[PDB]
Amino acid sequence: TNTKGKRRGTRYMFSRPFRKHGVVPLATYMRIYKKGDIVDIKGMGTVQKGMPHKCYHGKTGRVYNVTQHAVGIVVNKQVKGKILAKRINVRIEHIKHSKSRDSFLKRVKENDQKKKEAKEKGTWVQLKRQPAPPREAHFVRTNGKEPELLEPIPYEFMA
Template sequence: MKTYKVGDIVDIKANGSIQKGMPHKYYHGKTGVVYNVTKSSVGVIIHKIVGNRYLEKRVNLRVEHVKHSACRQEFLNRVKTNAAKKREAKAKGETVFLKRQPAKPREARIVKTVDNVPQTLAPVPYETFI
């Protein structure tokens, strides 16, 4: 059993073997923030799209149907690595670039046709066996 505190980011994942405190199917797979904790359940705030706006929905769920979100852990890991990079750069007297960059396009490749003759492909004719 994991402990949940107010402000934790959680993913809702319904467990079919426990029917009590189960979320509606809409909330399965959604991420929210814990706003209330009781001995066997947690209250989660979720933003639901209704029409052209977001509504804040408060859902009470049993702890079997929620789990800590990995997005928060990724953020904390990034904060640690950035702090380490800053310390190293400060010791060396350099500036460090901490912004995340999107993946760049792959470099171009050249396919040589010497000893690698292109092959013409054709579909296999359809045969019926009766």
């Protein structure tokens, strides 16, 4: 009984944030997108051309094609019990770079720097990041102060 409209249910999804209507800031147009880099699809509603479908809002894909105003993105979409890599053309207003990829490339560069430096200076260093370890043993000083005694408060109806 649901309609199959392209923008059904996008009332808040494609709406602008509070007090952020009007002219689109130009740094979004000034961003550079190469083939192979990772972008997040958002889909602002001020620009009605090149809009992604509502199923790609919030998804992340890889750029494979660059045109004058849009990019081609390979983004995974789950349909029933299969995931297929859809290719969508999205204008650059509706995308932004992925800071997850940015941080990963930064970490790779920093790890390569550490490898070179540590091979230069001999001593082995850890590069694989570990999960949070159990807390080590330590001493807690009282500083000559008795810890405060806490008791539950009596009940009373307030309002």
